[PDB]
Amino acid sequence: MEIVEYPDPILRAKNKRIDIFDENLKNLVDAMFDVMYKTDQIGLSAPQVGLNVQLMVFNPAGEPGEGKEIVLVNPKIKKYSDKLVPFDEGCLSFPGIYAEVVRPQSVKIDARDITGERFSISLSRLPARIFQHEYDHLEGVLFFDRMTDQVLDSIREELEALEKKYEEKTGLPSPERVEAR
Template structure:
């Protein structure tokens, strides 16, 4: 399934969208469903992809660029020009594996902070693509992790909220110049 949005996988000196960082209220608001997939939504997806590549990311959710919409872009292989990026509009996890795995995560909204997070190893996601067509994909490993991480953003959740090792969390946040008071611990 090739993306209808062609974006060169390269860094731009000036990304089209500004990232928001841990502590910014905009990252904690639940995103709204997208009623209609149109040219404006495709343009937003294009700008999100350009911003993600410019910031060396592999995923970006609309709330991270202060757009309160349920959309994310994902490209777990940004070095390979042949691998198309995914645009997920109104994504919903319809199935998650019982098998869980721990993996290190980082976030464009918390630069320099990398910590272990436990998530389901595989998921099935339904969403609309950038043409508005319903899609369903099965994802495992890195792709599953990235989609779950970005979908959390749509619910005002950040990966640091899921970190179980409080000591490592506090050390990493401090090192990155972030405050632990901006973490909303998920029980």
């Protein structure tokens, strides 16, 4: 398996609603989780593994046998919190890049589970901060789109290194560019 890095367009591509809840789905859930623990992270969205489906795995503790193992298919934010908290974020698809993004502190979420059943879970604190990072991905939103103009300028150069690496492995000009904003 592999980790799709910015600027790969898969990270931007539209993401397919999931209709079937079979064994294949559980296997892919399993793999995401195990990629999350391998890479020491607290969540992961399907596009990050090269699949454009509305799928996201999630453990608030980000440690094996700790926290919980949350699966959310076809999620949607029923609402965001009025209060905004800043906080420092990194993302797997942007190796070694860290910086601040300010977000609603809490969220009401509606998703389905791995079986088919439709639930409605409310999140705050670090879980709601992670959920939101991951759900953006589900929408093709990457955390630097959430960053201030000032925060973006610190990481401009490191984002570029990724564009150039992408250009080096593919030959194709980068399909998107931090300088564009």
